[PDB]
Amino acid sequence: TDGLIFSPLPQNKNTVVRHYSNEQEMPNLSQMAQRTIDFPTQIVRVSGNLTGLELSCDDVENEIDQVFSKKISPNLFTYNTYVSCGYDVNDPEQHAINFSIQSYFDPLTDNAVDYLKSYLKEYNGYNLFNTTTLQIENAKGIIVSMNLNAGLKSNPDKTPFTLYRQDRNNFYFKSNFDVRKELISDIYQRFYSNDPDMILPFFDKWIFSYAGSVYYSILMASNYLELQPERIFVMENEGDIFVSDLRYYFANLCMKRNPNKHCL
Amino acid sequence: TDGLIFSPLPQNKNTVVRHYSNEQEMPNLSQMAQRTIDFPTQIVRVSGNLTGLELSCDDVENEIDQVFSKKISPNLFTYNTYVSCGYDVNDPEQHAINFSIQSYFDPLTDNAVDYLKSYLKEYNGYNLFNTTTLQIENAKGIIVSMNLNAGLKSNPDKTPFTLYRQDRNNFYFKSNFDVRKELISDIYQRFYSNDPDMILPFFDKWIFSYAGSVYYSILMASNYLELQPERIFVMENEGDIFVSDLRYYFANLCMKRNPNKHCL
């Protein structure tokens, strides 16, 4: 089935992984309107060597959940968090030997912002296992480099399809919150629509200014579309970018939603 | 057909376009190494409304060639330039109504740097048609968001093909000069090869750390590849990016290169 599709997470031998996210949830504009200030997206990209510290992966994954993942509620934040812990498969105790935290998250309301500010006073810079510190950074901004695929898919349950056209466009936003408020919500409203005056103006805004004229014929010939909004976070240091491994794309299965069996 | 392929957006109605570039030339590392001064990529993104000035599109294109395109020689610069002129299709003289210049270029030698400084002295801020000014800007740096397509094209004379896999990876470079020295030259040496010990380590370096193992099966099943290195120029102001329509991609026509009729 179609809509948001999360990309598969990184696989590693002898590693326990926990993944926490509510990014699959459609943005709620009535909730997001309760935030009146711009606030930077939070970035965690932390790792450390645990060899010899006599920790179990359970000790590690649960110390991280008490000081981070459980402090970030799905009803105050949109988040996508990835916690990894490596262990030594030959050690009789199979003690942990490393860990990493990867996360980005946004407060959704002014109350969440207030809670967030007090969370950072208490836990930003927290000492993790006397090896590294929980560092929650401000993203300076985010560049979306978005790919659009249009074409004809013979079997909707398998991945190959015939590619008709491909386009790219790039946008700067202040935070992932804004990306969800402006781009993601528009995707749900107008990318999944067979109303010409919804989807073709959608292409004009996000693909290029007359993509609607180009795509009318293509949309009529096609039955399958994809939007890959790659999120390139820009950090304060020059040349420092962050692209999380937690990726998603939008699949539009026109052959199953429209009577036409096509995208227009 | 094979190699670097320029891909400008579909041409807008009633517009004349002149395109100038020597980006198609393979980089020669022994020549690029002779330049000792880093110089930032030069950026032109200039436009203006000409309605009513009684200029011919020829007047416009020839004035821009005299003050810009002919001052940027291919043996001192790699450049990619797009000069467009909109005209009034119903005016009996079809007078020009707007124009734009899109360009990036890099000096290739220390002498070119000196000559470039001479040109900016003389021509930066030049008055174009009493409407706008010729401005050459320094890019702060460049984010390459590179796409790889792999699949099967039955008819090499046409655009459709069956898409097997898609991947993106993102890198920061200080300049387009560095992009040609590090990325583009690697493309010519190893992307266009059916040697597993050439192409797959190329994939490990530029796609993701183990892409060679994933794509080994895929490359044998495929006969067609494309590399779309989108160049997102980072300008000096915060949130200011420039992505030209001066796009190119690399097509790998395995069904025509290889005895296998396939990419491996």
Side-chain angles (χ1 to χ4, degrees), chain A residues 167-194:
Chain A
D167 285 296
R168 192 99 64 99
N169 206 2
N170 308 282
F171 322 98
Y172 190 106
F173 298 87
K174 297 172 150 299
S175 53
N176 180 66
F177 176 103
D178 294 332
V179 172
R180 288 179 61 78
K181 183 179 191 189
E182 314 171 42
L183 172 62
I184 300 306
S185 62
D186 203 8
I187 292 183
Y188 285 103
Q189 256 151 41
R190 297 192 299 170
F191 176 71
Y192 298 97
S193 157
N194 70 339

Side-chain angles (χ1 to χ4, degrees), chain A residues 60-229:
Chain A
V60 159
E61 299 256 5
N62 299 168
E63 151 95 331
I64 287 159
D65 280 359
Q66 226 76 356
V67 299
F68 179 62
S69 324
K70 272 161 63 280
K71 297 315 183 261
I72 307 305
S73 160
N75 300 301
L76 270 59
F77 298 85
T78 303
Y79 59 87
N80 203 160
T81 292
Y82 169 69
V83 175
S84 172
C85 186
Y87 59 90
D88 182 350
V89 74
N90 308 302
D91 183 33
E93 308 275 337
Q94 293 193 332
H95 285 118
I97 58 165
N98 57 58
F99 84 97
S100 64
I101 303 162
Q102 203 196 108
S103 173
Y104 60 81
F105 55 99
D106 300 84
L108 300 171
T109 70
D110 290 347
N111 295 354
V113 169
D114 291 338
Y115 166 82
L116 176 57
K117 286 170 109 180
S118 99
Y119 170 77
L120 299 167
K121 200 79 151 169
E122 336 255 31
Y123 286 111
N124 201 7
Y126 186 94
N127 169 70
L128 290 175
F129 321 110
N130 300 298
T131 303
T132 190
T133 58
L134 180 61
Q135 298 272 44
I136 306 160
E137 305 170 66
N138 295 320
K140 182 141 92 86
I142 179 45
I143 290 164
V144 175
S145 158
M146 191 160 68
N147 183 77
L148 163 76
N149 294 325
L152 200 69
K153 175 176 275 193
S154 36
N155 174 4
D157 288 283
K158 229 313 178 192
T159 76
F161 63 96
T162 306
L163 176 59
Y164 285 160
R165 198 187 150 86
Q166 197 177 354
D167 285 296
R168 192 99 64 99
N169 206 2
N170 308 282
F171 322 98
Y172 190 106
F173 298 87
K174 297 172 150 299
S175 53
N176 180 66
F177 176 103
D178 294 332
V179 172
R180 288 179 61 78
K181 183 179 191 189
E182 314 171 42
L183 172 62
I184 300 306
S185 62
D186 203 8
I187 292 183
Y188 285 103
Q189 256 151 41
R190 297 192 299 170
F191 176 71
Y192 298 97
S193 157
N194 70 339
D195 181 348
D197 215 27
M198 293 299 137
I199 178 155
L200 301 180
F202 175 88
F203 283 5
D204 287 335
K205 175 180 200 199
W206 297 106
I207 306 301
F208 51 99
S209 68
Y210 51 94
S213 296
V214 174
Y215 268 87
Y216 176 56
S217 63
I218 296 171
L219 295 181
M220 288 196 291
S222 323
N223 75 349
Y224 184 74
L225 321 175
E226 293 182 346
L227 270 177
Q228 273 97 6

